[PDB]
Design a protein around this ligand. Structure first.
Ligand code: FE2
Length: 125
């Protein structure tokens, strides 16, 4: 019944969550993660592959890619899937200089669950 709204935990599990760690004087650090509130698997069969961060300062006609983080290890070795002991967590910190406030957009990818997007505001206060 569409009278009753709800929330999908699977979306929460995949969405890239943006947290501004500092922004004083245009020295900015932004953390992006997937599966913060609700852990996302990291196995050889199922994992988050990367996160990319975009920033568009106000007054700027075009957006700029700030950077991209690949998460390369997911437990595979010559001994089989999930045996290597090495798993890269889908968390990244982007450090950058900025002269103005503006909009952040993050993108991420799961190898079986498609492409994902998230947004937040950067206030240089
Ligand atoms: Fe997934």
């Amino acid at each position: 019944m569409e009278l009753f709204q709800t929330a999908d935990w699977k979306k929460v599990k995949h969405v890239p969550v943006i947290e501004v760690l500092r922004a004083e004087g245009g020295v900015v650090e932004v953390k992006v993660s997937v599966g913060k509130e609700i852990p996302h698997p990291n196995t050889t069969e199922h994992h988050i592959a990367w996160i990319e961060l975009v920033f568009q300062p106000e007054g700027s006609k075009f957006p700029y890619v700030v950077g991209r983080a690949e998460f390369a290890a997911h437990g595979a070795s010559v001994d089989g899937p999930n045996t290597s002991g090495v798993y890269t967590d889908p968390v990244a910190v982007f450090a950058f200089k900025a002269e103005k406030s503006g909009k952040l957009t993050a993108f991420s990818y799961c190898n079986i669950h498609g492409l994902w997007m998230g947004e937040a505001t950067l206030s240089l206060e």
